[PDB]
Amino acid sequence: RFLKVKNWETEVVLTDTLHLKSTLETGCTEYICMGSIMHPATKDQLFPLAKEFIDQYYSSIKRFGSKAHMERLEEVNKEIDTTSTYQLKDTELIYGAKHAWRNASRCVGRIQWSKLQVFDARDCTTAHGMFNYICNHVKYATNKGNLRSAITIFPQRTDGKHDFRVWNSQLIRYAGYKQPDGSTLGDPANVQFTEICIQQGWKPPRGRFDVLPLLLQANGNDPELFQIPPELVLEVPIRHPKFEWFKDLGLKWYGLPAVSNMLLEIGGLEFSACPFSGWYMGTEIGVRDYCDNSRYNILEEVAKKMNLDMRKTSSLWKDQALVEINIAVLYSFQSDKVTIVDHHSATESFIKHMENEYRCRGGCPADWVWIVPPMSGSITPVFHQEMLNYRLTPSFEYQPDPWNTHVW
Amino acid sequence: CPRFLKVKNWETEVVLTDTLHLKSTLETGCTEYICMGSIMHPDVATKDQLFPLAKEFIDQYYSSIKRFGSKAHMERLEEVNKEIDTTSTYQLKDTELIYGAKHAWRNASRCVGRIQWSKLQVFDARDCTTAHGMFNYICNHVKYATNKGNLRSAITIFPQRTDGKHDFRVWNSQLIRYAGYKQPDGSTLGDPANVQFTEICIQQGWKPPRGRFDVLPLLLQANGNDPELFQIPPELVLEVPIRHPKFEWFKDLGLKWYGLPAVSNMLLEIGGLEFSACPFSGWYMGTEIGVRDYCDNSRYNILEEVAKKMNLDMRKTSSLWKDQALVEINIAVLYSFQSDKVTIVDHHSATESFIKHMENEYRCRGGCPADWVWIVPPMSGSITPVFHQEMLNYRLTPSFEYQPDPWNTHVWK
Ligand code: HEM
Ligand code: HEM
Ligand SMILES: CNCc1cccc(-c2cncc(CCc3cc(C)cc(N)n3)c2)c1
Ligand SMILES: CNCc1cccc(-c2cncc(CCc3cc(C)cc(N)n3)c2)c1
Ligand SMILES: C[C@H](O)[C@H](O)[C@H]1CNc2nc(N)[nH]c(=O)c2N1
Ligand SMILES: C[C@H](O)[C@H](O)[C@H]1CNc2nc(N)[nH]c(=O)c2N1
Ligand SMILES: [Zn+2]
Secondary structure, three states: OOEEEEEOOOOOEEEEOHHHHOOEOOOOOOOOEOOOOOOOOOHHHHHHHHHHHHHHHHHHOOOOOOHHHHHHHHHHHHHHHHHOOOOOOHHHHHHHHHHHHHOOOOOOOHHHOOOOEEEEOOOOOOHHHHHHHHHHHHHHHHHHHOOOOEEEEOOOOOOOOOOOEEOOOEOOOEOEEEOOOOOEEEOHHHHHHHHHHHOOOOOOOOOOOOEOOEEEEOOOOOOEEEOOOHHHOOEEEOOOOOOOOHHHHOOEEEOOOEEOOOEEEEOOEEEOOOOEEOOEEHHHHHHHHHHOOOOOOOHHHHHHHOOOOOOOHHHOHHHHHHHHHHHHHHHHHHHOOOOEEOHHHHHHHHHHHHHHHHHHHOOOOOOHHHHOOOOOHHHOHHHHEOOOEOEOOOEEEOOOOHHHOOOO | OOOOEEEEEOOOOOEEEEOHHHHOOOOOOOOOOOEOOOOOOOOOOOHHHHHHHHHHHHHHHHHHOOOOOOHHHHHHHHHHHHHHHHHOOOOOOHHHHHHHHHHHHHOOOOOOOHHHOOOOEEEEOOOOOOHHHHHHHHHHHHHHHHHHHOOOOEEEEOOOOOOOOOOOEEOOOEOOOEOEEEOOOOOEEEOHHHHHHHHHHHHOOOOOOOOOOOEOOEEEEOOOOOOEEEOOOHHHOOEEEOOOOOOOOHHHHOOEEEOOOEEOOOEEEEOOEEEOOOOEEOOEEOHHHHHHHHHOOOOOOOHHHHHHHOOOOOOOHHHOHHHHHHHHHHHHHHHHHHHOOOOEEOHHHHHHHHHHHHHHHHHHHOOOOOOHHHHOOOOOHHHOHHHHEOOOEOOOOOEEEOOOOHHHHOOOO
16 A cells, blocks of 8 residues: 655655555565665566556556557567567667666666666677777766766677676776785775786786776677777866865776666666766765775875874774865865765755655655765765665666676 | 575675574564665554463573473473463563563664673563652662663563553653753754653643753653653763863853663563563763764754854855764764763774674574664764675564554543
8 A cells, every 4th residue: 555754854754656566576575674685588578578668658658558559569569479579669768768767776866867868779789889889978978077867778688698798897997906915906896807807908007096998798799808098088186175185195086987787677678788877976986985995995094194093983083084085075076077966965856856756756766775875874864764665667787797607 | 485594794795694584573564565674663462362472482581591391491381371371461580581681682673782782780670560669660770770970781671561551651762861842933942852742741740941951850650540750860860061172162062961871662572471661771872962862953953053163164065064063073972971981882883893793693693683774873884884784684572662652542540
């Protein structure tokens, strides 16, 4: 039946009806909740899924059961018969991609969901083609700093043996090197991937912030390396508005956040290669990339230059350093006219977006574990917002890392 | 359901295996189709409902003491059975009551302090008959737990529920709370979240000092009777004035807090028996005060006032002036508590201890139910180790449960 979600700051209550639409499992059961777990086709399987999606589409353009709708259902039928699959209309592709964003429970940026530039790359056949398409994506989405949401969609899966995959988990990442003395240069979370690239012929400049090459797999073939031209890769020097020594830390990050390891599911079709990009929330860099112990891990270094007493944890020296790091990140991007949102503004927008979705759509799936920012949680409004999590389709899903499932 | 579930720590790659979830008893609120993991809150037991619940708990008790299947075990089973058959209920032995209380804490998915679970002082108040007697028991609890600042965790357990019309209840959600007063102009004085309860007390006869930090009276209900008001002797309420190791102006904010965190509105369930009045207390994690009591918009809301005295650019939010003020506030809370030698734990220490706790529980017990949404601190989340820890949440018994607010259910005599 109907479910209610309360905000405990405002005492506003909303009524979720939309959840009655899902089918894919959350992973939880009545007795066990896995809300903090990160990772919890044939003709007869494929058609009902297609049927539902097509029905959903024509429902959204206000003509459910139209003549257009009828032939479409017939068209899809005969096509799954004689090819064991079907191809989406251009309008259905764009719709399905916007709604996959719209249904992404873990994304705090969804107020933007309808403003999405969709690049159809379903005529791609080679890794060289893929590279070209991704280069245009990057150039378009970056837009000299005035970032624009984009997705590039490559050919759907067919037989599992001829998959398109971007092997990079993100389009822009820094390399990670495993020093002899045991330390780590660059991004320590990328050391494996970085070494796969080296093993494939990549000449590493072995520096701290080295853009990794692209590793592209087209139609199931072995993947191939490509260097993204540097002028397409926008980067930002991180400096502080008060601490003039902060630039001396030598930090930079890239402006374009672009996830390339996920799977886009529309109407039971699987787009295994679908890089999508938006713009950053400052905490992603300031908190997670920089301060995670398993990442760049700069907190102790920064605390040094801030002259903080670091003997007891109760001095909250880590907390102080963290806030200052994130100030710099926001300031730097803003100074450089590169789009960025702070976690206060982003969460505000998200509560407004939630309100919108309950109003017009009867709910909005949201993953509180992911939505609440990794710092200053309860002084952002989403902390106090009950959210319901459920899985709506079309969707972005996780998939196996390609280097675990590829015969060469 | 699967016999083995794996959880991962994404910072350390450490993987743990949970078998304890199999012993889950009641429901989470989640289904396969929806997760309620961030929802805050998702006439008595019959003879036939009580039998298996009692046996379940007794079996569990004698397993813990390495006497499962012993003569004493079977005798206790038979005795409980006869008592349920003749009296429709039964009474716990003192040993069982202590075991059950310690395990309700142990099982409390939302508590980050559970490393301490086996060190809990249990006061048996099941011989209490009147509100005055409840008051005496609660005062003793407060004095014991407070221990002049060297706090000790404790629970006081009042008589179990019988027919439902004779409940013992502490009407206060917490033993020590500050009053809130709503003004004609819509401004609030004191703790704005507490205006409803404060109005109840005033109606019941309380003479309100109308100050910013007025400790509320206890409102105590014995054996189903109308509740009665009692003032906690002020000398038993230890308080800490908040000052800052660096900013000498911080003391000029006239802030202070109470030393003892004590929850009194929850229901303790042991072996199907319901203890509707079981105030328990521990000691504070700094963020509870520094972030929530002090900086929630619906609470004391001091971020603005502190920002101003810190000379912060407050036009752009991207300056993160809220964030900077929050850290300083939580620094001052920890500094004021340590200085007055009142037990407190910072959110780094607590969450690190909880990880060690959880790992030990996986090893010895086969699991450790935890509510990530509650365990992770409300500031600086990802620089505490619990943020990166996958947790399974499930409900084991004995347990602490929520219950309706008594002013919503009480039948006034
Ligand atoms: C436009 C501005 C956007 C903002 C400010 C934003 C914000 C965020 C943030 C902060 C995260 C957390 C990422 C992490 O912790 O790894 C996230 C995740 C996510 N976003 Fe958005 N996002 C934006 C655009 C988009 C777009 C354009 C799409 C798809 C077309 C999208 C789909 C997703 C998905 C599927 C996740 C989950 C990632 C995962 O599971 O690893 N987002 N978003
Ligand atoms: C000994 C030191 C303790 C520490 C450091 C500690 C820490 C915490 C914290 C930080 C919370 C969250 C409170 C909130 O956000 O409102 C909490 C909740 C809780 N604690 Fe512990 N606690 C301690 C002792 C105890 C004891 C002695 C018991 C029971 C015997 C207990 C049972 C619970 C329960 C049931 C909750 C959930 C409260 C609710 O749902 O409102 N804790 N604890
Ligand atoms: C798993 N979440 C943390 C994590 C671990 C490892 C790498 C990343 C990561 C690295 N580079 C870029 C990203 C982009 C994340 C993102 C995606 C999108 C579409 C928008 C946005 N603001 N942020 C993530 C994140
Ligand atoms: C619901 N959590 C936020 C909240 C709202 C309203 C009141 C409170 C509250 C007021 N006074 C004291 C507390 C103490 C909670 C607690 C209990 C125990 C046993 C230990 C501890 N560290 N903290 C909470 C908390
Ligand atoms: C909506 C959300 O569940 C609610 O704000 C929760 C979040 N996590 C919490 N965690 C703790 N420790 N205490 C709380 O009161 C809350 N509130
Ligand atoms: C174990 C836990 O689920 C994990 O650390 C999650 C928590 N929330 C998160 N939230 C975001 N936005 N990104 C993350 O990587 C994570 N990690
Ligand atoms: Zn769940």
